[PDB]
Structure 1
Amino acid sequence: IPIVAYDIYSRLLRERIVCVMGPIDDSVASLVIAQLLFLQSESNKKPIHMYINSPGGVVTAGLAIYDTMQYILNPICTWCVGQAASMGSLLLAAGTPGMRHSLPNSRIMIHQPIQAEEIMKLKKQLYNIYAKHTKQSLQVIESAMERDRYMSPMEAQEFGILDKV
């Protein structure tokens, strides 16, 4: 990792930029939550920018990150570079309305590649969040989350996951 004593990621964070790359798990979630809290303490009015390039991850960590993004008062812009699959698509769709962007050669997946009841409760939570942020019906979300396929930025724009491309 090249340096600028700052690293490249710390130099980027000086510009209020959080990078969510690679699989999402508990350590990544903790680091992202800490970065968001630090950025909010620096200022609660300035926008934040998130760049997503992720193959997916765990449901609990993604839900924690989503809750933290919805808690703070700053506007948040989300940009898809490369991949946004499974949990990354939730974060991409959870940005501020009018501030969700993608690059022309990006793929978006909302299909998902403890006991038997907690998994059902978490899945229903995901359905409700997706329906709230996409403005679809619940049945449409359950039907779409079952097919194993990717989407282009124009398809995701028609669905309701993105605003511009």
Structure 2
Amino acid sequence: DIYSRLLRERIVCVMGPIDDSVASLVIAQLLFLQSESNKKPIHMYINSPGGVVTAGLAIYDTMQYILNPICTWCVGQAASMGSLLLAAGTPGMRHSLPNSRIMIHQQAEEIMKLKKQLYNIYAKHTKQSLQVIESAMERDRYMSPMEAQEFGILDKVLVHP
């Protein structure tokens, strides 16, 4: 009676390494929250080092599939697939707390196809070029919330509400 209580506030948590199990729980919760209301916003808490790409894409696709506005909230960190989900929140509703850290850095033909899918998703949501996204994803570094805002991963850096 703590995370289910959290679900009653339309809050979904993406915490820790993303794998198929984590993704499937988050996905079910998003569908639950949509049936309760297809209008009311959903808050997505993201504190994650990232994880399995297809599992991250499962969550991403579900976020887009549901009608609801999705507010994303980066707390602690959003690295790799975590930052993709952070960036995939509804335009104007992508948030970070002040000390969060954001990282977009992560057969041979397959991993390249998945990489291009990530480039395309980042391009859609950040408004940066595919050329710049590709370059940025090579760089093993974290961004500050202001840097991430400038890049287009998020809209608001908040100290208080």
| Same fold at TM > 0.5 | yes
Residue-by-residue CA offset, 1:126-165 (whole Å, 9 max, x unaligned): 101111110011110111000111110111111111111x
1:46 deviation in Å? 1.0
1:69 deviation in Å? 0.3
- Match among 39, 46, 54 for residue 60 of structure 1: 54
Q: Distance in 1 between matches of 2:95 and 2:27?
A: 22
| 2:36 equivalent to 1:42 | yes
SS in 2 for 1:145: helix
SS in 2 for 1:11: helix
1:117 deviation in Å? 1.2
1:78 deviation in Å? 0.4
Give 1:3's aligned residue: none
Give 1:131's aligned residue: 123
1:116 deviation in Å? 1.4
1:42 deviation in Å? 1.4
Residue-by-residue CA offset, 1:1-51 (whole Å, 9 max, x unaligned): xxxxxx210111111110111000000001011111111111111111011
Q: Distance in 2 between matches of 1:86 and 1:26?
A: 16
Q: Distance in 2 between matches of 1:163 and 1:157?
A: 6
SS in 1 for 2:138: coil
Q: Distance in 2 between matches of 1:138 and 1:74?
A: 28
Structure 2 stretches of 5 or more lacking a match?
157-161
Q: Distance in 1 between matches of 2:91 and 2:14?
A: 20
Q: Distance in 2 between matches of 1:99 and 1:33?
A: 19
Q: Distance in 2 between matches of 1:154 and 1:45?
A: 30
SS in 2 for 1:23: coil
Q: Distance in 1 between matches of 2:71 and 2:114?
A: 26
Residue-by-residue CA offset, 1:45-96 (whole Å, 9 max, x unaligned): 1111011000110100010100000001011100010010000000000000
Q: Distance in 1 between matches of 2:10 and 2:50?
A: 24
Q: Which has the larger radius of gyration?
A: 1
What is the percent sequence identity of the aligned residues? 100
SS in 1 for 2:150: helix
Count of residues paired in the alignment: 156
Structure 1 stretches of 5 or more lacking a match?
1-6
Q: Which shows bigger deviation, 86-95 or 40-49?
A: 40-49
| 2:79 equivalent to 1:79 | no
Q: Distance in 2 between matches of 1:85 and 1:93?
A: 11
